[PDB]
Design a protein around this ligand. Structure first.
Ligand code: B1A
Ligand code: ZN
Ligand code: ZN
Ligand code: ZN
Ligand code: ZN
Lengths: 70, 69
């Protein structure tokens, strides 16, 4: 039904929000510290000097294990 | 249809996986450092000396800003 199409769209949007903001291909699994923005996969987070969201200096990257990881 | 029920269940499970594993009421927004397990809201994470997933000592809690929030 049309309700099935609405639910498919909600699911797709939630899944796309879990993907890296730089490569759009890999799941987010890394946090820029100390700001806390968690928006990249490990590879894209590795060479950024400043956070791509808030411009704060990246002192280090913390790996995150999330229950939504697939 | 039956597919509407199946999709409602998938959405419910994905939403529940984003909720705190301790209180089941608030969104996950905190990481136990250094282990990296990110399974609690800030209120439950503040009260745990050891990670509830791996039992490693919590040196500190890092707040996480996620796009799904
Ligand atoms: C099997 C056992 O004794 N404990 C155990 C170990 C790893 C996970 N993995 C995991 C948890 C939360 C978030 C992302 C991954 C869950 C439970
Ligand atoms: Zn990436
Ligand atoms: Zn930031
Ligand atoms: Zn909680
Ligand atoms: Zn842990």
């Amino acid at each position: 039904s049309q309700q099935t199409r609405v639910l498919q769209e909600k699911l797709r949007k939630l899944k796309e929000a879990m993907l890296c903001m730089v490569c759009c291909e890999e799941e987010i699994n890394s946090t820029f510290c100390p700001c806390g923005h968690t928006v990249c996969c490990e590879s894209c987070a590795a060479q950024l000097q400043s956070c791509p969201v808030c411009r704060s200096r990246v002192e280090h990257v913390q790996h995150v294990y999330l229950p939504t990881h697939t």
